[PDB]
Amino acid sequence: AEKRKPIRVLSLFDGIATGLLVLKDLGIQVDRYIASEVCEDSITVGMVRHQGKIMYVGDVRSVTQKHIQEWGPFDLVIGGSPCNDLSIVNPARKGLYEGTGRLFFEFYRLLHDARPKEGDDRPFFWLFENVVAMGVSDKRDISRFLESNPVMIDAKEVSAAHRARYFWGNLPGMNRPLASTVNDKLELQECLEHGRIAKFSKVRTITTRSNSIKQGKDQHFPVFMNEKEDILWCTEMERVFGFPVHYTDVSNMSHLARQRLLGRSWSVPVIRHLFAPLKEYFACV
Amino acid sequence: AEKRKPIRVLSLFDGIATGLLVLKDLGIQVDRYIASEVCEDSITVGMVRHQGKIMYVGDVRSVTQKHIQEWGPFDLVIGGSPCNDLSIVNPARKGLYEGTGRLFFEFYRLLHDARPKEGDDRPFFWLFENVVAMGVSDKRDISRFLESNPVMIDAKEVSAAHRARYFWGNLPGMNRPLASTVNDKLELQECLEHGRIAKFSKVRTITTRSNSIKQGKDQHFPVFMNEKEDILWCTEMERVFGFPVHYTDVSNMSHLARQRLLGRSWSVPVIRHLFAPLKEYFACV
Amino acid sequence: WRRQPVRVLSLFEDIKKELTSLGFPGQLKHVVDVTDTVRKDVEEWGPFDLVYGATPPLGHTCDRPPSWYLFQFHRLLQYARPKPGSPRPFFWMFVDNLVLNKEDLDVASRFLEMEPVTIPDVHQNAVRVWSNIPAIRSRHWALVSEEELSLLAQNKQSSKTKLVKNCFLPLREYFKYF
Amino acid sequence: MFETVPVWRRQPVRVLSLFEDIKKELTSLGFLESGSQLKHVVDVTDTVRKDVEEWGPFDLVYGATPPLGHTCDRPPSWYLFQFHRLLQYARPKPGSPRPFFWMFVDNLVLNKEDLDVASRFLEMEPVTIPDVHLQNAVRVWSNIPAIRSRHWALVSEEELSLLAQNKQSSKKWPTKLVKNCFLPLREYFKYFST
DNA sequence: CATGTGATCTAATTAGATCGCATG
DNA sequence: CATGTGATCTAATTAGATCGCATGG
Ligand SMILES: Nc1ncnc2c1ncn2[C@@H]1O[C@H](CSCC[C@H](N)C(=O)O)[C@@H](O)[C@H]1O
Ligand SMILES: Nc1ncnc2c1ncn2[C@@H]1O[C@H](CSCC[C@H](N)C(=O)O)[C@@H](O)[C@H]1O
Numbered sequence: 001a002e003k004r005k006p007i008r009v010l011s012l013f014d015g016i017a018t019g020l021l022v023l024k025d026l027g028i029q030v031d032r033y034i035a036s037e038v039c040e041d042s043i044t045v046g047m048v049r050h051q052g053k054i055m056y057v058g059d060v061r062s063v064t065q066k067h068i069q070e071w072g073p074f075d076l077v078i079g080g081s082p083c084n085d086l087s088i089v090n091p092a093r094k095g096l097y098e099g100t101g102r103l104f105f106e107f108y109r110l111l112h113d114a115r116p117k118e119g120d121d122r123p124f125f126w127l128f129e130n131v132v133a134m135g136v137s138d139k140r141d142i143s144r145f146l147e148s149n150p151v152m153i154d155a156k157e158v159s160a161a162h163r164a165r166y167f168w169g170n171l172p173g174m175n176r177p178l179a180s181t182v183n184d185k186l187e188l189q190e191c192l193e194h195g196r197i198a199k200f201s202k203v204r205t206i207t208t209r210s211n212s213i214k215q216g217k218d219q220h221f222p223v224f225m226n227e228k229e230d231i232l233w234c235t236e237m238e239r240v241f242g243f244p245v246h247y248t249d250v251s252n253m254s255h256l257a258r259q260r261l262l263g264r265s266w267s268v269p270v271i272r273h274l275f276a277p278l279k280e281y282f283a284c285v
Numbered sequence: 286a287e288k289r290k291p292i293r294v295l296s297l298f299d300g301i302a303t304g305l306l307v308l309k310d311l312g313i314q315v316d317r318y319i320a321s322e323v324c325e326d327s328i329t330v331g332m333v334r335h336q337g338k339i340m341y342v343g344d345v346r347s348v349t350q351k352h353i354q355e356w357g358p359f360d361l362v363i364g365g366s367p368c369n370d371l372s373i374v375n376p377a378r379k380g381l382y383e384g385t386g387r388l389f390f391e392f393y394r395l396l397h398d399a400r401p402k403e404g405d406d407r408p409f410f411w412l413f414e415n416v417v418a419m420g421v422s423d424k425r426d427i428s429r430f431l432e433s434n435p436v437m438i439d440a441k442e443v444s445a446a447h448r449a450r451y452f453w454g455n456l457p458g459m460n461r462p463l464a465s466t467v468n469d470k471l472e473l474q475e476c477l478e479h480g481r482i483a484k485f486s487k488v489r490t491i492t493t494r495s496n497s498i499k500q501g502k503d504q505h506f507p508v509f510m511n512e513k514e515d516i517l518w519c520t521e522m523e524r525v526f527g528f529p530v531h532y533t534d535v536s537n538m539s540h541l542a543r544q545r546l547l548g549r550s551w552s553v554p555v556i557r558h559l560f561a562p563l564k565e566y567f568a569c570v
Numbered sequence: 571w572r573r574q575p576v577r578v579l580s581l582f583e584d585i586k587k588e589l590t591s592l593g594f595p596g597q598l599k600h601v602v603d604v605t606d607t608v609r610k611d612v613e614e615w616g617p618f619d620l621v622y623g624a625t626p627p628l629g630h631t632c633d634r635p636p637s638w639y640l641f642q643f644h645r646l647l648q649y650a651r652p653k654p655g656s657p658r659p660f661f662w663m664f665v666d667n668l669v670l671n672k673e674d675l676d677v678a679s680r681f682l683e684m685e686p687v688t689i690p691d692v693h694q695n696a697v698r699v700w701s702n703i704p705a706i707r708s709r710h711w712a713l714v715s716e717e718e719l720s721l722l723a724q725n726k727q728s729s730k731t732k733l734v735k736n737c738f739l740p741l742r743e744y745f746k747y748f
Numbered sequence: 749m750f751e752t753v754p755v756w757r758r759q760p761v762r763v764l765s766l767f768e769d770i771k772k773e774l775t776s777l778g779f780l781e782s783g784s785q786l787k788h789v790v791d792v793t794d795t796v797r798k799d800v801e802e803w804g805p806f807d808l809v810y811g812a813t814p815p816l817g818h819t820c821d822r823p824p825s826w827y828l829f830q831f832h833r834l835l836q837y838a839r840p841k842p843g844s845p846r847p848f849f850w851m852f853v854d855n856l857v858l859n860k861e862d863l864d865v866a867s868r869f870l871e872m873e874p875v876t877i878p879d880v881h882l883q884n885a886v887r888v889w890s891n892i893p894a895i896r897s898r899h900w901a902l903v904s905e906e907e908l909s910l911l912a913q914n915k916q917s918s919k920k921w922p923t924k925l926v927k928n929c930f931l932p933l934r935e936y937f938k939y940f941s942t
Numbered sequence: 943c944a945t946g947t948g949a950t951c952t953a954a955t956t957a958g959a960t961c962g963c964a965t966g
Numbered sequence: 967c968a969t970g971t972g973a974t975c976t977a978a979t980t981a982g983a984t985c986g987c988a989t990g991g
Contacts, residue, residue: 048478065871082971089970091962097823102865105829109869117842133965133970140793145833147797163971193333193535207971210958217968219959233537246531250478252518255537256957264971346676350683367947374946376986382635387677390641394681403653418946418989425605430645432609448947492947495982502944504983541980549947
C-alpha cells in the first residue's frame with residue numbers, strides 16, 4: 001500500500017515520439033521525457049504533437065555520463081538505433097561496427113550509465129528494438145552487449161502490416177502472447193479512406209521506400225479506387241502503423257517525407273502491448 | 286401548417302465542396318447536392334470528406350437544360366467560376382470572353398435553366414462569387430448578365446486573412462453587417478500550431494502561389510519557430526480559411542497541391558454568414 | 571387573315587435595307603450597343619415578335635471578340651420573350667458569317683439549344699443560322715462539309731448576302747405582306 | 749582512489765589482458781613470478797559475464813589494438829567496444845576498497861572518428877607517447893594517476909599523422925612505449941625479480 | 943500606390959524503377 | 967522461394983525569384 005510515481009523516461013533515437021504517445025495512451029503519468037534525436041522533421045512532430053513536453057538533448061553522442069546523472073534518475077530507457085547499415089535489404093550495409101550501425105553502442109553506453117547501481121532495487125525498465133532481417137553475427141553481438149536474448153514480435157497479429165521486429169529488454173511479460181484488442185485494425189480495408197477497396201488483407205513490411213507499399217515482386221498496387229489502381233495514402237499508413245490520423249501532417253512534409261518518418265517508426269499496438277504492464281509500476285489516470 | 290423540406294442544391298465549380306460543408310455545419314438538411322467539377326483532387330476531397338453524398342456530374346459544359354429538368358428541381362444554385370483569366374494578378378489574363386473566363390456564362394446559363402417559371406413562387410436562392418480585383422468592364426458585364434450588383438465581403442473581418450470577394454445573389458440579408466462569432470479565429474496566432482509565433486495579425490490574400498504566403502513586397506516570412514523564420518503550414522492555411530484541420534490531407538497531395546485547392550476556395554466563415562438565413566427556409570437537424 | 575405587322579428587334583446589324591426590300595414610327599428597334607441595355611430597356615421598347623442578331627463579316631470595325639456577340643444576343647433574347655400567357659408567335663434569328671471557330675461554335679449550339687444549318691453560295695461566301703423557325707431547320711437545304719466552309723473561310727481571309735434575305739422571307743406567312 | 753598502501757600489505761596483481769599477451773612485459777618488471785595470476789583471453793566474441801567472474805577477480809584490465817599490420821580480421825573499433833564490454837564485467841562490486849586499474853592502448857590504428865568514440869566510451873582523452881631515439885607512438889586511456897600527472901613530450905596529432913603515414917608504409921607492438929605505463933603500478937602491488 | 947482565387951523559368955531537391963543477397 | 971526500418975540512379979517536381987499593371991482605395 002504505497003503510492004507510485006510518474007515515470008521518468010530517457011528515449012534515444014526518439015523518432016516521432018511513439019514512446020511518449022503510447023505512455024499517454026496508457027494513462028501512465030510522465031514526469032520527464034528526455035529525447036535524443038537529430039532529424040528536424042522528427043523533432044517537429046514530437047514538439048507539436050506533445051506540446052513541448054519532450055525535452056530534446058540533440059545527438060546521442062553528445063550525452064555524457066555527467067548528463068545522465070544530472071537529468072536522471074530514469075525509470076525507463078527506450079530506443080531503436082538506425083538499421084540502414086544493419087538490415088539485409090541494403091546491399092551496401094556497413095554493419096554493426098560501422099556507418100550508422102555503431103550508433104547501437106551509444107544505446108549500450110547510455111543504458112549502462114542509466115542503470116541503478118547493484119544494491120539499488122528501485123524499478124528500472126529498458127527496451128531495445130531492431131529488425132529481424134540483420135546479419136547473424138550482428139544479432140549475436142547485440143545480444144552479447146545487452147546480455148539478453150531478444151523477443152520476436154511480428155506486428156501482423158495486431159495490425160494490417162507485416163513487421164517482424166526484435167525486442168531486447170526486461171519489461172514484464174515481454175514474451176506473453178499478443179492479443180488483438182478491439183482498437184486494432186487487423187485488415188487493410190479498415191485503414192482505408194471512404195470509397196477505396198483493399199486488394200490485400202495485410203500489406204508487406206513498410207520501409208522508407210515507395211517500392212515497399214507496392215506488394216510483392218510484381219509490384220502490385222494495394223488499393224482500388226474508382227476501379228483504378230492506387231497506393232496507400234499517408235493517413236492510411238498512419239492507421240496501418242496505429243498512429244492517430246494526420247499525426248505526421250506537420251511541417252509541409254511531402255507524402256514521402258511522412259513515409260520516411262513512418263517507415264522508421266514502431267508499430268503502435270506492438271509497443272502498447274510491451275508497455276502495458278508498466279502501469280502497475282508507475283502512477284496512472 | 287406546412288413543414289419545411291430538405292434543400293436541393295446545384296453546385297457549379299464545386300471545388301472542395303465548401304458549400305455542402307457550410308450547409309452541414311448550419312444543420313440544414315440536404316436532400317441532394319449535385320456538383321459540377323473537373324479537377325480530380327477536388328472531387329477526391331469532396332468524395333472522401335462527404336462519404337459519397339455529392340452527386341458529381343462532370344464538366345459544367347456537359348450539363349443541359351434536359352439535365353436540369355430531370356435532376357431538379359433545385360432550391361439553391363451556387364458557384365464561383367475560375368478567375369485566372371479575370372484577376373488583374375495575371376498579366377496574361379484573357380478576360381471574361383475567352384480562356385476560362387467564358388465559363389462564367391455557363392453559370393449564367395444553368396441559373397436561367399434552374400430558375401422557376403414566372404408564376405412559380407417556390408423558394409429559390411442562388412449565389413455567385415468572384416474576385417474583386419478584376420477589370421471594370423468584366424465586372425460590369427457579370428452584373429449585366431446576372432441583372433444584379435454584387436456585395437463586397439472581405440474575409441478579414443471574420444478571419445485572419447485579407448480576401449475581398451464579390452458576391453452576386455438573392456440570399457436574405459446579403460448586405461447585413463458581418464459579426465464575429467467566437468468560433469472565428471481573427472488573428473494569425475490563433476491558427477498556428479504549438480510552438481510557432483505569428484509576425485502578423487492578418488496575412489495578405491492567399492492564392493495558389495507560394496509568394497502569396499510571404500508578406501509585403503519584400504516577401505517577409507509570416508511565422509517564427511524556435512527563432513527561425515517560416516511560412517504557414519497546410520493545416521494553418523486550413524484554419525486561416527476556416528476549414529476543419531486536415532480537411533485537405535487527402536490523396537498524397539503535396540503542400541502546393543493542397544494550397545492549389547485552398548487558394549481557389551471560399552472563406553468558410555463568409556459562406557456561413559451568407560447561408561445562415563437559409564435555415565429559416567429549409568428543414569434542419 | 572388577322573395578321574398584324576411584324577415587330578423586329580435587330581442587334582449588331584440594321585437589316586432595314588433588306589427589311590423593306592422584303593416589304594414588312596418604325597417597328598424595327600435598333601440598339602446602339604447592348605453593353606448597358608438592360609431588361610427595362612427592352613421591355614419599354616414594346617413587345618417583339620422576332621429578335622435578330624448577327625456576327626460582322628470577316629473584316630475590321632469589330633472591337634469585340636466573336637463570342638461577345640452571341641452571349642449578348644442570348645442575354646437580350648431572354649429579355650424579349652413574352653409571358654407564357656401571351657399567345658402571339660415569337661421567332662429569333664442568330665446567324666454567323668464564318669467568323670466563329672470550332673470552340674465558339676459549340677458554345678453557340680449549347681446556349682441556343684440547337685445546331686446550325688449552313689447556307690452556301692458559289693457562282694461568294696457561306697453562312698450558318700440558328701433559329702426556331704420551322705422553315706430553315708425543317709426545309710431541306712444543300713449540305714456542305716464543315717471543312718468545305720473551313721477552306722472557303724481561309725479563301726475569304728486570303729481574299730480581303732441574298733441568303734440573309736432568303737432566310738428572312740419565310741416569316742411572311744405569319745405577318746403582313748408588302 | 750589515488751591512495752597507496754604500505755609495502756608489506758601488497759598482493760600479487762591479477763591481470764586480465766585482451767587482444768595481446770603482456771605476460772613478458774609484466775614479468776620483466778616483476779609483477780608476476782615465473783611459477784606456472786594473469787588471464788589472456790582468446791576471442792572475446794563469446795565471453796559472457798559469468799566467464800570473467802569465474803576467472804577470479806582482477807585488479808587490472810588491459811586492452812590493446814593490434815599494431816599497424818594486416819592482422820585486422822576485425823574493424824579497429826571492434827577491439828575498443830569489446831574492451832569496454834569486458835571491462836564492465838571485471839569491475840569490482842561497489843563495496844570493494846582495493847585498487848582497480850584499467851588501460852587501453854592504441855598504436856595509431858584508430859582514425860579521428862574512432863578516436864572520438866574511444867574518448868567518449870572511456871570518459872577521458874588519450875595520452876600520446878613519443879619514441880625518440882621519432883620511430884613510434886602510442887595513445888593510452890587509463891585511470892592510472894601517474895599517467896595523467898606526468899607529462900611526456902607532447903606531440904601534435906598532425907605529427908602522429910605523418911608517422912602513422914610512415915607506419916602504414918613499412919608494414920609487432922612497441923613494448924618500450926608500453927612498459928613505462930605499468931611503471932607507477934608497482935607502488936600498488938607486490939614486486940618480484942630474478 | 944500597395945495590392946493580387948497567376949504564370950514563367952531554372953537551379954537545387956525530390957519522386958519512382960530497378961537492384962541487391964543473407965537469412966530465416 | 968519469398969523477403970526487406972535501403973540505395974542508386976533516371977525523369978519528375980518545387981522552391982523561389984521574378985514578372986506584371988489596373989485598380990480602388
Ligand atoms: N546521432 C544521432 N543521435 C540521435 N538520434 C539519431 C542519431 N542518428 C540518427 N538518429 C535517429 O534515430 C532514429 C532511428 S529510427 C527509430 C525511431 C522511433 N523508433 C520511432 O518510433 O519514431 C531516426 O529517427 C534518426 O533520425
Ligand atoms: N469546365 C469546368 N466544369 C466544371 N468545373 C470546372 C471547369 N473548369 C474548371 N472548373 C473548376 O472550377 C473551380 C473554380 S475555383 C472555386 C472552388 C469552390 N468555390 C470551393 O470552395 O472550393 C475549380 O475547382 C476548377 O477545377
